[PDB]
Amino acid sequence: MFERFTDRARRVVVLAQEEARMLNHNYIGTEHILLGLIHEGEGVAAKSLESLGISLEGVRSQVEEIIGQGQQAPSGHIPFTPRAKKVLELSLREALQLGHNYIGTEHILLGLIREGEGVAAQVLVKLGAELTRVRQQVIQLLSGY
DSSP states (O other), rough: OOBBBBBBHHHHHHHHHHHHHHHOOOSOOOOHHHHHHHHSSSSSSHHHHTTTOHHHHHHHHHHHHHHHSSOOOOOOOOOBBBHHHHHHHHHHHHHHHHHSSOOOOEEEEEHHHHHOSSSSHHHHHHHHOOOHHHHHHHHHHHHOO
């Protein structure tokens, strides 16, 4: 399932799980993948989001306002929302189309933007980062060579 992921992209998912757990969330949603992307820091996704002033604390706070903390931290494995799974499926399609054999942070963010209709998307907009501008930042950073 994560065989195609880069090392950094694996950390994104692992950190997404813990972001969900910290909020006593019962699923890893798109917003937790967003947090995992920021958390990684060195990837194209984090750089793109940082350039648009999208911060870890900004996102966590929005998530808390929109979703709110759950009552019980889950133990062990937290499943993906259907939407988050769709984002990861789309992440593969992004990587394939761009001619990569691996899924990197860039592809996860492009996948997330492409889905464009869950909590992550809601958060981004609330924070002033329109989805097209997020995608543009990612493409620009991938186009500088």
